[PDB]
Design an enzyme around this catalytic site. Sequence first.
Site, PDB file in Angstrom:
ATOM      1  NE  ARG A  68     -19.260   7.312  -2.415  1.00 16.86           N
ATOM      2  CZ  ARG A  68     -20.582   7.379  -2.843  1.00 16.86           C
ATOM      3  NH1 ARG A  68     -21.077   6.097  -3.712  1.00 16.86           N
ATOM      4  NH2 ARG A  68     -21.149   8.358  -2.790  1.00 16.86           N
TER       5      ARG A  68
ATOM      6  CG  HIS B 221     -19.177   9.542   2.086  1.00 15.58           C
ATOM      7  ND1 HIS B 221     -20.259   9.762   0.999  1.00 15.58           N
ATOM      8  CD2 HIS B 221     -18.147  10.030   1.821  1.00 15.58           C
ATOM      9  CE1 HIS B 221     -19.625  10.483   0.079  1.00 15.58           C
ATOM     10  NE2 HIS B 221     -18.366  10.560   0.509  1.00 15.58           N
TER      11      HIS B 221
ATOM     12  CG  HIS C  22     -10.645   8.756  -5.133  1.00 15.45           C
ATOM     13  ND1 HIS C  22     -10.778  10.039  -5.512  1.00 15.45           N
ATOM     14  CD2 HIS C  22     -11.570   8.220  -4.407  1.00 15.45           C
ATOM     15  CE1 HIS C  22     -11.961  10.418  -4.637  1.00 15.45           C
ATOM     16  NE2 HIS C  22     -12.372   9.251  -4.116  1.00 15.45           N
TER      17      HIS C  22
ATOM     18  CD1 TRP D  80      -9.863   9.454  -9.849  1.00 14.22           C
ATOM     19  CD2 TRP D  80     -11.019   7.419  -9.059  1.00 14.22           C
ATOM     20  NE1 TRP D  80     -10.844  10.070  -9.243  1.00 14.22           N
ATOM     21  CE2 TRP D  80     -11.602   8.797  -8.582  1.00 14.22           C
ATOM     22  CE3 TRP D  80     -11.613   6.219  -8.629  1.00 14.22           C
ATOM     23  CZ2 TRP D  80     -12.881   8.871  -7.893  1.00 14.22           C
ATOM     24  CZ3 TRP D  80     -12.455   6.298  -7.537  1.00 14.22           C
ATOM     25  CH2 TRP D  80     -13.418   7.720  -7.510  1.00 14.22           C
TER      26      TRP D  80
END
Length: 267
Positions: free
Chosen positions: A31, A35, A159, A175
């Site tokens: 992540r 980003h 995810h 998830w």
Amino acid sequence: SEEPPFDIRALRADIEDMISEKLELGPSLIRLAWHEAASYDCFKKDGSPNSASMRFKPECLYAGNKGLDIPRKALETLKKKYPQISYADLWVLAAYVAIEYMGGPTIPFCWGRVDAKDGSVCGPDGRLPDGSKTQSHVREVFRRLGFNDQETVALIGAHTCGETHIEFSGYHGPWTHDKNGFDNSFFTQLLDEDWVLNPKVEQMQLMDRATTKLMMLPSDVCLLLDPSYRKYVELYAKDNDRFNKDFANAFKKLTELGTRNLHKAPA
Ligand code: HEM
Ligand SMILES: [Ca+2]
Ligand SMILES: [K+]
């Protein structure tokens, strides 16, 4: 192949070691790297992707980046120990290591990213995708990054690992049933479950009817609603090797946006 000035073999091994002591860290490294690339706009040609510009205000304070101080700080140790690596290369490398460590693909790494020196290169807020928005927004963001629908879906498949945190996004839960495994199960959970409203999370999210312990964001389930995205959800759900291969290609492209003069690392 070209040997980088930092000890990449030892450094890969240190990253694996850090991840093994703090499991929740692997997914946050992914992540982090995502980003740091997602700020790019390929039409305006700005946003300073893959430059570790997230170390600076205003970028570090964007709502979409809440919580990424943790992987940032964890990587600081390793920066002290391998001072020749740029932060930018470090974030990317960590994420590649994270992905392989969790059973994902081995992405060929390129080194040589230059770190942003100050926050003046930061792009505006509103570049990171919002979990509460649906396909027209997701397509807008990824088209702004330079990706087609195929690469879009492959990327969101990350995810497969990790989870949401109330204190960071306001969403709660993983998830998939194995948040430390990297494979196509995000796409499998997405088609095989019945996603019902979770009535007790303030920020609208869905849960699987079968156990209620999995979640999906509106931006995840929008991939089923949009006929073009659905196509690739099916693709990857039914062929893990294809997802491994497309993900590796899309992630490398992503962590190479707006970069130049890179060298191929040895495997
Ligand atoms: C539609 C675009 C996307 C949206 C709206 C989105 C949204 C989110 C949200 C809301 C979280 C929870 C953050 C938290 O509470 O800690 C999250 C986590 C995460 N995201 Fe995404 N995401 C998107 C695409 C991506 C992509 C393209 C990647 C990588 C290729 C990615 C990788 C991850 C990973 C690995 C986590 C788990 C982080 C952890 O456990 O600390 N996401 N995402
Ligand atoms: Ca950036
Ligand atoms: K998984």
